[PDB]
Amino acid sequence: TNMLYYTRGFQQMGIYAVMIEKMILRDLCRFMFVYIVFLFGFSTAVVTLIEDSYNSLYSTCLELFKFTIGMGDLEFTENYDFKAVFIILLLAYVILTYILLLNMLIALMGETV
Amino acid sequence: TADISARDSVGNTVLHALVEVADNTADNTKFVTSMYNEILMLGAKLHPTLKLEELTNKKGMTPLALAAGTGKIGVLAYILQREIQEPECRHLSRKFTEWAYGPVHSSLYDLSCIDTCEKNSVLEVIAYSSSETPNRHDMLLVEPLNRLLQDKWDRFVKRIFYFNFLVYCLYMIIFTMAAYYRPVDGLPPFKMEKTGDYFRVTGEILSVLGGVYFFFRGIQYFLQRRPSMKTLFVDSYSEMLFFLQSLFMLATVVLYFSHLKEYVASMVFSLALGWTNMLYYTRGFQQMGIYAVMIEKMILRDLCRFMFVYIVFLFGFSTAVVTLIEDSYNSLYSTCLELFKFTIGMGDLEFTENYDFKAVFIILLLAYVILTYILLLNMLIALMGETVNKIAQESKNIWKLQRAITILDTEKSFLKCMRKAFRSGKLLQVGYTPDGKDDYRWCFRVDEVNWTTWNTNVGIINEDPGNCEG
Amino acid sequence: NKIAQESKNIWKLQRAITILDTEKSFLKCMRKAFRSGKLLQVGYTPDGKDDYRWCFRVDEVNWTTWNTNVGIINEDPGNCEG
Ligand SMILES: CCCCCCCCCCCCCCCCCC(=O)OC[C@H](COP(=O)(O)O[C@@H]1[C@H](O)[C@H](O)[C@@H](O)[C@H](O)[C@H]1O)OC(=O)CCCCCCCCCCCCCCCCC
Ligand SMILES: CCCCCCCC/C=C/CCCCCCCC(=O)O[C@@H](COC(=O)CCCCCCCCCCCCCCC)COP(=O)([O-])OCC[N+](C)(C)C
Ligand SMILES: CCCCCCCC/C=C/CCCCCCCC(=O)O[C@@H](COC(=O)CCCCCCCCCCCCCCC)COP(=O)([O-])OCC[N+](C)(C)C
Ligand SMILES: CCCCCCCC/C=C\CCCCCCCC(=O)O[C@@H](COC(=O)CCCCCCCCCCCCCCC)COP(=O)([O-])OCC[N+](C)(C)C
Ligand SMILES: CCCCCCCC/C=C\CCCCCCCC(=O)O[C@@H](COC(=O)CCCCCCCCCCCCCCC)COP(=O)([O-])OCC[N+](C)(C)C
Ligand SMILES: CCCCCCCC/C=C\CCCCCCCC(=O)O[C@@H](COC(=O)CCCCCCCCCCCCCCC)COP(=O)([O-])OCC[N+](C)(C)C
Ligand SMILES: CCCCCCCC/C=C\CCCCCCCC(=O)O[C@@H](COC(=O)CCCCCCCCCCCCCCC)COP(=O)([O-])OCC[N+](C)(C)C
Ligand SMILES: CCCCCCCC/C=C\CCCCCCCC(=O)O[C@@H](COC(=O)CCCCCCCCCCCCCCC)COP(=O)([O-])OCC[N+](C)(C)C
Ligand SMILES: CCCCCCCC/C=C\CCCCCCCC(=O)O[C@@H](COC(=O)CCCCCCCCCCCCCCC)COP(=O)([O-])OCC[N+](C)(C)C
Ligand SMILES: CCCCCCCC/C=C\CCCCCCCC(=O)O[C@@H](COC(=O)CCCCCCCCCCCCCCC)COP(=O)([O-])OCC[N+](C)(C)C
Ligand SMILES: CCCCCCCC/C=C\CCCCCCCC(=O)O[C@@H](COC(=O)CCCCCCCCCCCCCCC)COP(=O)([O-])OCC[N+](C)(C)C
Ligand SMILES: CCCCCCCC/C=C\CCCCCCCC(=O)O[C@@H](COC(=O)CCCCCCCCCCCCCCC)COP(=O)([O-])OCC[N+](C)(C)C
Ligand code: NA
Ligand code: NA
């Protein structure tokens, strides 16, 4: 990752790596903070609902982080007790994170660039 | 002769009428702002001992607070930056000059009814404005208001806000950690058998005391700040979500002692809101606050248009697919659910071999895929990108208003805890009344420097006997 | 970025085509197209008769044409159609 220092001897790669640092400090920094509010916000909301194994805060923050990377199973646990709660609570996470906030990130990168 | 106090059936004097007539155009603003001076000169020339701007109408609104409320920003800019440079019309000057050494000069704006008048202060009348007041978000760029709220913030509210944040951070930790460790075995209410269960009910007590808290604090927002049916569900997207959090959080108390497991359905919606409602407290932070303004606009401009159209297609093709399935994915849930997976990148194009015509099925999904994943989610990114270009400074001006509403509720809350609102300005003499007395106006300093007004026409300069308040 | 106002102008035309098919459809259900304007006198013909043109009002305000060159103004005998 520190090879990206030595882009600074190259105008088009160096500027690119300047456009990396600004995003990590402007856009990811604002993003990932808000993202972890929702993530831990719905994660706790889901493992609170689970009873029993996905009754952990890791294995539910881990499974809800998969919706980010396009690997979210909307049925990763049948060990709930109210489905409408669970489904309302994930699709809320999905809409607010995958559709809204990752695509909002692309928008802010676009305005940053 | 004509009585300059032009009280009418509605009570609007001439200055009121000149606020009501404005349009926030350049030709009209250039006009009406001038006219106040000559009306004010004449009011001070032909009928002294009656400063004309304190007068009100039937509804009880000064022309200052009538410009604050009716959305008149260029009018309001004049009345706040009013700088009359001539004797016997100078007490009406609103922006004084406490000194000027070289280019530097300390402007001395008055905080007459920007904050803490007996009714309708400019910050209230802007902050506590309804929804469709034009220019509402730009009306705090007007000096001294931009630098007055940043003064109250850095000096009073930044320390109480970051405390209220912390108390809400721990309220969530206490409520989260009291819900994670809930009793799975049995039907409520539950017992404090183990030692940890005493700490757990404690976090449940402390959880409900905050649910009734944000409940009452969401009631009295509708008793202090009386909204209309349009401004319930618009312009107040926070006082509802913290109040809504309490509805779930108190239904959680109903359904715990009503002997049901449905308390989980409500207790869990209080957590998702509760952490999602941490994004309120970004409004004490410029870059995070604007970001959260760029969240609300998307949810209301872009998701709102998007998700509606998306659910037309989704239910449009879902019904089209389960119509084709025969038999298990012969449900409208398990087909809307499977077709929603193409959105999140988890679409199996072969999630059912229990069809009867494959070309129908495949034409019908790839139509859904192209029109939703490739077109409409990427179209969403495009519209966000055009939104972000639009709402760049229009979100910073919503932010300073979010912070402004916070600065004023903080004043009203701590009206007896520590002090009043602190008055955010030094009582200072600016000159002399036309009746021959001191003035002593609550004024807010603004050190300003200008490298082109080299002459420095003295005019007002008050402590020119001094040099810099020493 | 290109099609921002070029799509609002396609929109008003989509709505326009809807407004006119709606007229043609309900030509006998309720009424004709409603004629969307008040038959009003605007002056006098050059042959010396009334005009009575189906006209559409547009309240307009301008804060720079202070002189108000009278010119046409028709119900200046009145003031605001009272
Ligand atoms: C049985 C129940 C069924 C439900 C229906 C019942 C009614 C629903 C509730 C009504 C509301 C519905 C909201 C829908 C989503 C949109 C939310 C949103 O735009 O909010 C922005 C808000 C801004 O502040 P404010 O309002 O103070 O500022 C306003 C505002 O800027 C204004 O433009 C300016 O004039 C001025 O600045 C000021 O006047 O920010 C916050 O309030 C903090 C952040 C809040 C979170 C933002 C993210 C959105 C989360 C939504 C989902 C909730 C979480 C998941 C729950 C799972 C299911 C339970
Ligand atoms: C870039 C830096 C890295 C970021 C990573 C981000 C990733 C997400 C966050 C990561 C950091 C925080 C994770 C939680 C702390 C560990 C405890 C836990 O998981 O579970 C605790 C339970 O109780 C709870 O889960 C609720 C209590 C939360 C209290 C801590 C506040 C965290 C604040 C930040 C939160 C976000 C708020 C927004 C932040 C701005 C106990 O531990 P356990 O072992 O899980 O329980 C098993 C107990 N049992 C066996 C008896 C049943
Ligand atoms: C943000 C808010 C949430 C949004 C959620 C969005 C998610 C999508 C939409 C969600 C809401 C609507 C879902 C359908 C209503 C339930 C009935 C059903 O599913 O199946 C019914 C069948 O018949 C049909 O499925 C077709 C009949 C549809 C009539 C309802 C119109 C819905 C309008 C809105 C539609 C979108 C139009 C565009 C909207 C602008 C009967 O119920 P069942 O149990 O399924 O059938 C089993 C019967 N059996 C056992 C005898 C075989
Ligand atoms: C010379 C390096 C020898 C390295 C040998 C090692 C292998 C080769 C390694 C890397 C490739 C480097 C090739 C350099 C020559 C290409 C032409 C050029 O000058 O630049 C051009 C292409 O620019 C590039 O190709 C720059 C890419 C390197 C960026 C470094 C980050 C990660 C390195 C990870 C490396 C993994 C290493 C693991 C495997 C060994 C662009 O033109 P410019 O220069 O922008 O224009 C003038 C700039 N000026 C204004 C400053 C004047
Ligand atoms: C965005 C602003 C923030 C809003 C925050 C608050 C939002 C919260 C919303 C709603 C709160 C209540 C929802 C949960 C109900 C409690 C559980 C319950 O009793 O379930 C019952 C089932 O009931 C159903 O299966 C039907 C569910 C109807 C609601 C679906 C849409 C709600 C989301 C609209 C979103 C629009 C948002 C606004 C935008 C337009 C019975 O229990 P069960 O065990 O589930 O029964 C079997 C279930 N099974 C057959 C499925 C297996
Ligand atoms: C800004 C804030 C963000 C938004 C926050 C709020 C978001 C709230 C989100 C979602 C709220 C809406 C879904 C509720 C959850 C399901 C609960 C339920 O009743 O399940 C039953 C559905 O029974 C049906 O009849 C469903 C018919 C409609 C399609 C299902 C939704 C598709 C999910 C994708 C929607 C994507 C679009 C998203 C738009 C929302 C299941 O019953 P069952 O026991 O399995 O019985 C099987 C057979 N049966 C189905 C025939 C009965
Ligand atoms: C968190 C980090 C972030 C920073 C913030 C720090 C936040 C505060 C931090 C910690 C406060 C809590 C410490 C006491 C409990 C520890 C012992 C215990 O019971 O352990 C158990 C977990 O815990 C529980 O089961 C108790 C439930 C959670 C307590 C919620 C806070 C209570 C309010 C008062 C708080 C102070 C407020 C008022 C102050 C004036 C161990 O689990 P177990 O036994 O394996 O299984 C669960 C038990 N069961 C199976 C029987 C169901
Ligand atoms: C309970 C007995 C005390 C023990 C509790 C132990 C603490 C555990 C915590 C939380 C548990 C306490 C009960 C929960 C209350 C609900 C949350 C709440 O009120 O938030 C309010 C805080 O604003 C206040 O004025 C809070 C009241 C004072 C709390 C005193 C305890 C803090 C101790 C710890 C201090 C540590 C300091 C360390 C410094 C480094 C929210 O502010 P608001 O102005 O309403 O604005 C939002 C509402 N709006 C969006 C609608 C506008
Ligand atoms: C707003 C102005 C002020 C409001 C008033 C001031 C106070 C407000 C605060 C608190 C007072 C309580 C208000 C809510 C009602 C309590 C729950 C209840 O009655 O449950 C009933 C059932 O319930 C269920 O069957 C489902 C319960 C879970 C629903 C989850 C969503 C909670 C919504 C939260 C509300 C969000 C609403 C959003 C508002 C837009 C219990 O009654 P029952 O007859 O025994 O039914 C048993 C049925 N069963 C056996 C099949 C299970
Ligand atoms: C003080 C708060 C204490 C909270 C303690 C709790 C832990 C810490 C919590 C949160 C981190 C807060 C650190 C604040 C100090 C950083 C430097 C700074 O001032 O701002 C900088 C960084 O800005 C941020 O770091 C703001 C991030 C908080 C946004 C709140 C939303 C979600 C919170 C979820 C929290 C999960 C909680 C669960 C775990 C406890 C940016 O500068 P600025 O300020 O924009 O510039 C001037 C602004 N002005 C114009 C207004 C003057
Ligand atoms: C965009 C504007 C909206 C248009 C809306 C209307 C579009 C509708 C389009 C077409 C309508 C007809 C298609 C379905 C045929 C009926 C079923 C049938 O008889 O299938 C036959 C099979 O036939 C095939 O397997 C070959 C299918 C040929 C068509 C493929 C391209 C059509 C999409 C072009 C899209 C371009 C769109 C325009 C852009 C350029 C026989 O039955 P079977 O049981 O299936 O036989 C075994 C099948 N198996 C071997 C596969 C297993
Ligand atoms: C604006 C509105 C949105 C657009 C709406 C319209 C969109 C309409 C979309 C798609 C229309 C085109 C596909 C039709 C569906 C297949 C039906 C069929 O005949 O299946 C047979 C295909 O037999 C072949 O020989 C297929 C050869 C071409 C590649 C198949 C398509 C690839 C899917 C990806 C295309 C991605 C690109 C998408 C571009 C369209 C299967 O026969 P079998 O029984 O399994 O036999 C096995 C062995 N055999 C295959 C050798 C025979
Ligand atoms: Na993906
Ligand atoms: Na994927």
Numbering used by the authors:
A (entry chain D): 550 to 601, 627 to 687
B (entry chain C): 275 to 601, 627 to 769
C (entry chain B): 688 to 769
Which statements did the authors publish about this structure?
Thus, a founding member of the vanilloid subfamily of TRP channels, TRPV1, represents one of the most sought-after pain therapy targets. Here we report the cryo-electron microscopy structures of human TRPV1 in the apo state and in complex with the TRPV1-specific nanomolar-affinity analgesic antagonist SB-366791. It includes a transmembrane domain (TMD) with the central ion channel pore and an intracellular skirt that is mostly built of ankyrin repeat domains (ARDs) connected by the three-stranded β-sheets and C-terminal hooks. The TMD is composed of six transmembrane helices S1–S6 and a re-entrant pore loop (P-loop) between S5 and S6.
